[PDB]
């Protein structure tokens, strides 16, 4: 269950 709020940047 991945967190959609995790870091989306490089």
């Amino acid at each position, epitope marked *: 269950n991945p967190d959609p*709020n*995790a870091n*989306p*940047n490089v």
Partner: antibody
Amino acid sequence: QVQLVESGGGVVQPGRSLRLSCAASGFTFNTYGMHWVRQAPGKGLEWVAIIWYDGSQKYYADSVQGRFTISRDNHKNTLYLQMNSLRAEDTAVYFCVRVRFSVGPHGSAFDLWGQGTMVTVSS
Amino acid sequence: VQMTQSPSTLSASVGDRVTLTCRASQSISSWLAWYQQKPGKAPKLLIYDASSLESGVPSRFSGSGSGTEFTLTISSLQPDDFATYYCQQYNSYSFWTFGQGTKVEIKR
């Protein structure tokens, strides 16, 4: 300078499709997570979709799951929103939005917004 | 997570200290941001992580709070600070949700 410029908005019939585009310039666009956020007439801000910097994950608001797809071109520095099965409730200004860069495991606030492009859905 | 702002409108004058309130329906730690938006324009980030002043934002803006109770303060209202202010959470597993805004209007 550092900007986001949206285009593609217009008046469209319900059931039809429309593609929004957002041209980024002035920063290393292919290292940022990017969002679409929308604002219906007279209303507040509502999150629409997120795409990771490398396209590897995407998430969508309940109301657009199965209808909208977010994508990006990391060579042209462009963000897209393909909007299908449009309905009157989708009428809104759509903003492309950059997430503030962060180090570590967590995403951040929205530090850069485009001017917005208006989608009106009506028969 | 639902974000609730109060008051929905306030009336103020240039030079006034103004303080806006934002409440979260459940704890969001410090993953809270404030934005300013004027009619026909896009929002501008003011405060992130509940109390960090965004780069380039005037120093009259400050933010405070954690958990469920947050405030934004403008130490001294400037003539261009009349606008709507939104708070927004980006807590883990909570997506992104905004308060409904507080409009700061001109008193007369």
